[PDB]
Structure formats: C-alpha cells, structure tokens
Amino acid sequence: GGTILVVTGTGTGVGKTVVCAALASAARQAGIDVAVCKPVQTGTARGDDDLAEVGRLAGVTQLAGLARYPQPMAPAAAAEHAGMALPARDQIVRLIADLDRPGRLTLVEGAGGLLVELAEPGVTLRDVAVDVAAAALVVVTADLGTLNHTKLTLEALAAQQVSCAGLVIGSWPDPPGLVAASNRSALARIAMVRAALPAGAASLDAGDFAAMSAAAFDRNWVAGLVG
Amino acid sequence: GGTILVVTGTGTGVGKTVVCAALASAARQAGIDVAVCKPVQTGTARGDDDLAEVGRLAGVTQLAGLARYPQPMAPAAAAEHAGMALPARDQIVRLIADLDRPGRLTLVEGAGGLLVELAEPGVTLRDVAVDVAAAALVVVTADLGTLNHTKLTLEALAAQQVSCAGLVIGSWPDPPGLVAASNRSALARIAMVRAALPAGAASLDAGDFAAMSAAAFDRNWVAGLV
Numbered sequence: 001g002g003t004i005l006v007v008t009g010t011g012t013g014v015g016k017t018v019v020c021a022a023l024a025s026a027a028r029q030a031g032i033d034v035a036v037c038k039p040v041q042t043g044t045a046r047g048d049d050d051l052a053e054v055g056r057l058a059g060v061t062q063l064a065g066l067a068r069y070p071q072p073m074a075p076a077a078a079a080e081h082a083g084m085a086l087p088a089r090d091q092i093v094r095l096i097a098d099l100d101r102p103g104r105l106t107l108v109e110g111a112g113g114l115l116v117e118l119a120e121p122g123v124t125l126r127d128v129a130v131d132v133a134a135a136a137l138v139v140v141t142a143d144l145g146t147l148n149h150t151k152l153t154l155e156a157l158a159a160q161q162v163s164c165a166g167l168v169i170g171s172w173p174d175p176p177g178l179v180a181a182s183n184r185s186a187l188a189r190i191a192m193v194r195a196a197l198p199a200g201a202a203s204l205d206a207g208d209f210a211a212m213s214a215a216a217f218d219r220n221w222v223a224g225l226v227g
Numbered sequence: 228g229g230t231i232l233v234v235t236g237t238g239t240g241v242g243k244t245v246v247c248a249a250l251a252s253a254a255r256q257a258g259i260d261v262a263v264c265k266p267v268q269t270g271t272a273r274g275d276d277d278l279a280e281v282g283r284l285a286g287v288t289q290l291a292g293l294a295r296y297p298q299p300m301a302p303a304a305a306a307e308h309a310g311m312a313l314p315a316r317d318q319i320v321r322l323i324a325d326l327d328r329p330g331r332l333t334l335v336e337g338a339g340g341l342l343v344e345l346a347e348p349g350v351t352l353r354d355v356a357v358d359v360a361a362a363a364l365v366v367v368t369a370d371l372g373t374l375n376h377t378k379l380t381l382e383a384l385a386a387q388q389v390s391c392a393g394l395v396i397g398s399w400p401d402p403p404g405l406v407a408a409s410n411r412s413a414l415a416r417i418a419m420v421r422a423a424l425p426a427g428a429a430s431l432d433a434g435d436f437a438a439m440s441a442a443a444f445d446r447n448w449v450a451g452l453v
C-alpha cells in the first residue's frame with residue numbers, strides 16, 4: 001500500500017477541509033497521487049459537502065464518501081434525526097483500504113474533532129487511525145485557547161499510539177496579533193508545525209490556491225510522505 | 228481537611244468563573260463554608276478579576292490568588308510579555324492546601340482549559356489537582372463541538388487519575404435550539420450534568436444570582452460535597 005493521513009482538528013470549524021485541499025494540492029504538484037476521503041459527512045441539507053470543496057479548490061477527482069446526513073449536527077445526532085444509522089467501523093476502514101495504494105497519499109478528513117463518534121459504538125477517527133495504521137495531522141487555530149485544545153488532542157493521539165504527523169495552523173491572520181504570534185511560537189514547541197494557511201484561502205482561485213499551497217508546505221516534508 | 232474541587236473547562240470563556248460563583252452560592256445556602264482560589268489571573272489591564280466576581284455574586288470572602296498579569300493572554304504568554312515568571316508549583320499547591328479545612332468547600336479555578344501552564348515549569352491545573360487530591364468539575368458549553376471537547380478533557384483527567392465530579396453547562400441559551408438540546412442529552416451520556424446555567428447570569432445582582440444558583444443544582448449533591 002501507500003500512505004494514509006487522517007486530517008483531524010482541535011474542534012469543528014478549524015480549517016480541516018482547506019488543509020486537506022492545500023496538502024492534496026501541494027502533493028499533486030509533487031507528482032504524488034492523492035485521494036481524499038470523507039467517510040462521515042453531516043449537514044448536507046445546508047449544502048455542506050467537504051468532498052466537493054476539496055475538488056473545487058484542489059482539483060482532486062479521487063473523492064470518496066460513504067454516509068451523508070442532512071442536519072448539521074454530531075453524526076450520532078444527525079443520524080438519529082434522519083432515522084438512519086452510523087456506519088460500522090469496518091465500513092470506514094474498508095472505504096480507506098480500497099483507496100490505499102503504493103505511491104498514493106490518501107487524506108481522511110473526519111467529522112469535526114478527534115473524539116467525535118463516527119461509527120457505532122463510540123468508534124472515533126482515532127480508532128480508525130489505529131485500524132489503517134495512519135498518522136494523524138492535526139489542524140489548529142491561533143486563537144486563545146488553542147494550546148490547551150492541541151495538547152489535549154495530542155495526548156489523545158498518544159493513548160492509542162497514533163503518530164502525530166504534526167500540526168497545520170488552519171487560518172493564519174494577516175497581520176497576526178500578539179496572541180496569535182505567541183501561540184504560533186508556543187505550538188511550534190509542542191509539535192512540528194507543517195504550515196500556516198493564510199486566512200480566507202477558500203476564496204483564492206485554482207492557480208492562486210495552488211501557489212499558496214506549494215508555498216505553505218515544505219517540499220521535502222511532502223515528498224517524504226510517500227515513497 | 229475538607230473538600231477541594233478544581234473547576235476547569237473545555238476551553239476559555241465557557242463560564243468557569245460564574246460556575247465557581249453559582250456552586251459557591253449553592254453551598255453557602257446549604258450552610259457550607261466556601262473558599263475560591265484563583266492562583267493566576269491575566270487580563271488585569273482591562274479589569275479582569277474573576278475573584279471579585281465570585282465575591283459580588285456569591286458573597287465569598289475567602290478569595291485567594293497569587294499573581295495578576297495585565298495582558299489578556301494565557302498565563303505563560305502574559306508572563307513572558309510582562310517579564311516575570313509564573314508562580315512556582317509549591318506556591319499554588321500550598322495556597323490551596325492551607326485554604327482546605329474541614330467543613331469547607333474549596334473551589335480552585337484555573338485559566339482557560341485543563342492543560343494550560345499555570346506555574347513554572349509547565350505545571351498545569353491537572354498537576355495541581357493531583358497533588359491536592361482534588362476532583363475536577365468540568366464546565367462545558369452547549370454548542371456544536373462540546374462533545375469532542377468534553378471527551379478530550381475527561382480523558383486527560385482520568386489519565387492522571389483525577390476524578391471527575393461532573394459537568395456543568397457554563398451557559399444555557401434561550402431558546403435552546405437543536406444543537407444545544409441534543410447535546411444536553413449527549414453530554415449526560417458521558418458524565419453527570421449537575422447544572423446548566425442560564426445565559427446571562429453574570430449580569431445578575433447577588434440576590435437574584437443567589438436564587439438562580441439555589442435552583443440550578445441538586446440540593447442533595449451540593450450538601451454531599453462536604
């Protein structure tokens with residue numbers, strides 16, 4: 001097989017999809033095949049579709065989903081509202097596994113924060129990362145409160161020995177205020193910071209987003225992800 | 228000794244301070260003697276003072292603290308900016324332990340969430356809670372995300388074998404809404420929910436806040452703390 005990265009976050013809203021898209025973009029400009037996989041997707045009745053957005057921004061055509069719920073809630077709530085069920089654990093692993101392939105980077109965006117239930121019972125993205133032997137890349141903010149949330153997330157990745165690919169600062173303000181700059185230094189002491197995506201990048205166009213994306217990440221880190 | 232709860236949160240601004248007050252208000256009306264420690268305080272330039280708020284709202288007079296930094300940052304950043312180290316771990320633990328006496332409920336409030344550094348070098352609210360054999364009351368929000376955040380923190384806690392005395396929803400919104408009403412139920416599936424405090428209660432004067440706080444907790448559980 002190839003490489004699997006689950007792309008996680010300190011909470012919901014933190015920039016996960018833009019990161020999936022940015023790293024997928026950057027990898028494709030390294031000749032690296034990329035699939036992105038959104039196993040649980042809630043809030044589709046509000047037009048949320050994280051798979052479509054990665055394609056829309058990065059041009060990834062290898063987009064893989066499974067469950068979709070209408071209401072923008074926790075997947076257990078969104079399922080329970082629609083009368084539906086969550087996937088079983090093996091369905092999410094099977095979905096990633098068939099995507100897996102040597103020379104290919106498969107990114108797996110979960111639904112919100114690391115410990116959000118994704119499959120019955122209490123199965124989270126962290127359990128799924130164990131099953132497919134994936135490292136997790138953790139998307140963070142610069143806002144107040146982020147150091148605690150991150151530290152909590154990494155402590156959780158360690159309890160099941162899920163390696164940390166590092167952190168990406170999801171939205172980097174320009175200019176950064178005093179809190180933002182400090183936290184940027186503080187998180188760099190907590191883990192390798194892989195990139196800091198400039199705020200509002202979801203309004204850059206194809207070429208702009210790709211330029212931004214090639215800039216955001218270290219070439220040697222990206223190319224080192226798949227051999 | 229008596230009872231020491233640490234009052235932590237799944238983040239910042241979740242209502243840690245007014246839960247300290249509402250729990251303190253409820254204990255006093257149960258004839259319990261209450262003390263609130265808040266070792267570090269940032270944001271004092273714009274007038275941040277969580278201890279004064281507990282005093283106004285619950286009438287606590289045993290209100291202890293060790294430093295005050297002007298910047299509204301997380302302690303260690305606020306210290307770095309001032310040029311002045313955090314207090315030492317010993318200061319914090321022993322302040323809290325000298326507060327502890329039989330018949331008293333000693334609430335400890337940190338700064339932000341559980342893993343923020345409170346003292347040099349890197350000692351958190353969680354460390355403190357271990358050394359003084361305190362349990363954690365976890366203050367939570369009701370918004371989308373409360374769940375991942377609650378679960379992270381309850382884990383963190385149990386990792387160092389710091390018991391969880393429960394969850395309080397910092398602020399209940401009016402009217403709730405689909406997320407909040409769902410989460411209030413999902414939250415009860417991961418830990419006991421001891422209260423949910425109505426949004427906006429910080430603005431009450433002390434007579435009205437007292438009556439709110441009396442109603443917000445189960446009386447048996449309150450008295451059973453000490």
Ligand SMILES: Nc1ccn([C@H]2C[C@H](O)[C@@H](COP(=O)(O)OP(=O)(O)OP(=O)(O)O)O2)c(=O)n1
Nearest residue numbers: 012013014015016017018112197198200201202
């Ligand atoms: N560098 C960035 C980061 C985020 N966004 C925008 C797009 C989104 O409207 C919002 C948040 O980004 P995401 O949707 O990608 O974050 P999440 O995937 O984490 O949301 P959710 O957790 O619900 O999936 O900010 C942006 O424009 N530029």
Ligand SMILES: Nc1ccn([C@H]2C[C@H](O)[C@@H](COP(=O)(O)OP(=O)(O)OP(=O)(O)O)O2)c(=O)n1
Nearest residue numbers: 239240241242243244245398424425427428429
């Ligand atoms: N039932 C409630 C709960 C909270 N608040 C308000 C008061 C404050 O203006 C704001 C933030 O609340 P807290 O100060 O209680 O929150 P924290 O103590 O957790 O914030 P911090 O972590 O900065 O100390 O919420 C309110 O009015 N009514």
Ligand SMILES: [Mg+2]
Nearest residue numbers: 016017050109
């Ligand atoms: Mg998303």
Ligand SMILES: [Mg+2]
Nearest residue numbers: 243244277336
């Ligand atoms: Mg407070």
